[model samples]
Target: SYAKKPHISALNAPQLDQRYKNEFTIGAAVEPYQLQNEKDVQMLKRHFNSIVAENVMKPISIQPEEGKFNFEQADRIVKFAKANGMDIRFHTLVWHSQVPQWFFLDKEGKPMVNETDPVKREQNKQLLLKRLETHIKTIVERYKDDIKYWDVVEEVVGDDGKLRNSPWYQIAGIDYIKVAFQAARKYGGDNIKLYMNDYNTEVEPKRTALYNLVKQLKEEGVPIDGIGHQSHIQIGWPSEAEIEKTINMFAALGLDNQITGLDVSMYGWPPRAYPTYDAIPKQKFLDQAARYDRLFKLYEKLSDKISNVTFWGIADNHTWLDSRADVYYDANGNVVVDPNAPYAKVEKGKGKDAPFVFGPDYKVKPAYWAIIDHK
Candidate 1:
């Protein structure tokens, strides 16, 4: 018989609150390393119907060394997901960051980090392709039937309309991304859906490239299934028109899509306005909430074309937004806050009290309730 409260159970009594009964699927993204203790696992399992195992599922964590595969951390996450009866989305199989050094070194013991050099580039490409094959084969084969969704390639497109120039791309070239999808298909069997995930993909050149890339993949019979748009939006940026256009463009390609990293920061004020305190005024808070409310409504409208919507983290305190450039104070004293901080102002009434959701206790703040109410 199962324990009354299995250590890995993803649902808790409180989250079973009547209000959430009809709410869309709720889930949280967590790193396996963060769930080091049993209690951590238990807590995470209680609230989420879906669990996204963070970096452990990525290439660096699984295949840290060439020809060597380590499943120690990944196994724990999979086991936890199974115990909780949660749908699992693997964080990533390929990314530019958190990659191993061996990926960029030459046989003669020199670093092979060059994007423009022909001979070095070819060697790098061979190494990357072989590594991609081995990494995808091992992980996907092991969890073939268990994992249903995957971020096959993460953040490959840059804002400047170019493939990201990581050591992987420098040596291996853009074909590294193509090989990843092929390997996933080879090892993932028929049940899995592959996704190309990235942030700010609803705007400009990045959006254009992803649209074209997915269309090309489909034409080539590459088994591409979905697109994960990391929707880390601010209050005023990425207007409604841009958001809809981005969604429609990707949806037009006839692939499943998701709002993977949904978070809104109130701190994106115009520059030189609020120097001492980076607080958003009451009017701005309402506007911010409206923007969030509108975005989710858009998601619901496009739900037919989307598979899953994932928040990058559970709360603002844990968001990657806190670490984004020009959003936080850096040690370098460069006034790194948002450049538009000067023009934005707080509204007069209830809006002034809205953004306190990121306090130390992690209690549901106004913004949290705002989100819940909007949903």
Candidate 2:
């Protein structure tokens, strides 16, 4: 007889603290540079059983200069995780951004070959393959048996339902993705799981592409073990049904799936035009909370298919909620304001109105409690 185990709940924390003492796993997403200070490391000891280090394990951060691999920052992070009895999740090894210059240039300073030209593309492919072999080998060999999971590839899928048009893709064609997985497998030990992470796969075209890609990779003997959905969603991008469907689709592939970079912003709403953050009112927060409640319930029900859920950041103070693509601020310099009202014509330097209510001293907001209570 199989006994059912309750779902495991995970949260992000800066340090080991009473609030997270009994939690299944309290973790934090941190950058390697931040862990250089001892106090910061001590603070992290309180809350996390897992540490997701940013950039440290990526090609750009590890090998800033061609052929020169630097592991000083990454070493400290790994050591800290080991000392604290924590599991380490190496955030990413491959990404479109933060790539080193050497990746785009040959030893002779010529433009690194690109996929646009067949001959040059083949040459670049060879170069990239060699680079990936060395990079993956060195990192995986060094961290073998230490890190538990890794985002072997990150954000390879574009929101527009196509493989991202990166230089790697240009040089190596779609085969680059497969090559990366193989390299990671060659170096990654038995215990480490390789994950393909991307955002906005809840929609049809993008979702279908990922599904097909994963299926093809599985059939072709690629060493992929999991898929990471970078759930950086807006308020209404993924309705409840959409999220569930996406989860089920990925689960059906017989691969481990987890929600990475979960952040639901309330910057866009009603009228659909670009509204400033100050334009958001209290009702918007309430609406956002309701959305969260619904999303969490769906997550709780689907815990069997999903392994872990992580937020991009913990607080609104640190959130990338500002108006880049959407309006995230108002003229009043506060987050929550009257949504029905028009934007005030205040100076740009003035603090924009904040829509979300951060807790006292900007601690955990009610949204945090909402999530905690939901769990």
Reference-based TM-score of each model: 0.78, 0.79
Candidate 2 stretches with Cα past 4 Å from truth are 1-26, 32-47, 114-120, 269-282, 320-362
Q: For model 2, how many clashes?
A: 21
| Model 1 spans > 4 angstroms off | 1-24, 33-43, 114-123, 269-287, 325-360
- Model 2: per-residue Cα lDDT over 182-205, one tens digit each: 887778766788899988778878
- Alpha-carbon error at 184 in model 1, in Å? 0.5
Estimate the TM-score for candidate 1. Answer: 0.78
Model 2 CA lDDT for position 370: 48
Cα-based lDDT for every prediction: 0.66, 0.66
RMSD of 2: 6.7
Q: Each candidate's root-mean-square deviation in Å?
A: 7.7, 6.7
Residue 45's lDDT within candidate 2 is 60
